[PDB]
């Protein structure tokens, strides 16, 4: 039947929140109190793909927006982008591979591996207000999820 989706927020293992800074642009920063309304709410879709006990294929769309995180080669490197889609056709169970992350449960945290680019992860910097990026050292790949109404 329809693809199944949950509303959620993500925080990195230094408890940095993710926000839409600019057009098609994600950064991460320490947020608490009133300013937490600025955080991005995801619609996490459970999509078709290779699955195991602790490795579950998802897509990450922005809640009630036709925008998905997407892994594509840019100037010859796997990168993370926000990509616009046809709002009539999404979300769907058979998401294209560039939209698919393997959500991996390791030591009570989550990592989001690119299905398209093995061993490349959704990452943040230790520094405040820096972009969210694909990284596959010195990066944060460990998140926690908060389930939203
Ligand atoms: C969703 C990400 C997209 N960002 C990029 O920098 C993409 N990019 C990397 C190398 C070249 N382009 C900014 C932060 O939010």
Ordered by where they begin, the domains of the chain are: 1-149 (2.80.10.50)
What does each C-alpha distance from 43 to 48, 55, 82, 125, 142 come to in angstroms? 16, 18, 14, 23, 19
How far away, in angstroms, is 131 Cα from ligand 1 center?
7
93/83 Cα distance (integer angstroms): 17
Query: Cα–Cα distance between 64 and 55 in angstroms, integer?
Result: 26
Ligand 1 atom with the smallest distance to the CA of 133 is 2
Instruction: Give me ligand 1 centre to Cα 24, in Å.
Output: 8
Residue whose CA is at the smallest distance from ligand 1 atom 13:
25
What string of DSSP letters covers 5-25?
Answer: EEEEEEEETT--EEEEEETTE
CA dist 49 and 102 (Å) reads 9
Mutation choice for ligand 1 from 29, 77, 80, CB with most ligand atoms inside 8 A: 80
Q: Which residue, 86, 144, 72, 84, is CA-closest to 114? A: 72
Element (H, E) at 45: strand 42-46
Experimental technique, in short, is X-ray
* Ligand 1 pocket list (CB less than 6 A): 25-26, 74, 79-82, 131-133
Which residues, including other chains, have CB under 8 Å from residue 126's CB and lie 6 or more apart?
14, 138, 140
């Amino acid at each position: 039947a329809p693809v199944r989706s949950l509303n959620c927020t993500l925080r990195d293992s230094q408890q940095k929140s993710l926000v839409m800074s600019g057009p098609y642009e994600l950064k991460a920063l320490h947020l608490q109190g009133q300013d937490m309304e600025q955080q991005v709410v995801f619609s996490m879709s459970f999509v078709q793909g290779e699955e195991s006990n602790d490795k579950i294929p998802v897509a990450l769309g922005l809640k009630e927006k036709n925008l998905y995180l997407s892994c594509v080669l840019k100037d010859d490197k796997p990168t993370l982008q926000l990509e616009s889609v046809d709002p009539k056709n999404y979300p769907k169970k058979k998401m294209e591979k560039r939209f698919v992350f393997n959500k991996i449960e390791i030591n009570n945290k989550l990592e989001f591996e690119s299905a398209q680019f093995p061993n490349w992860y959704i990452s943040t910097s230790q520094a405040e207000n820096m972009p969210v990026f694909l990284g596959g050292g010195q990066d944060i790949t460990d998140f926690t999820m908060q389930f939203v109404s």
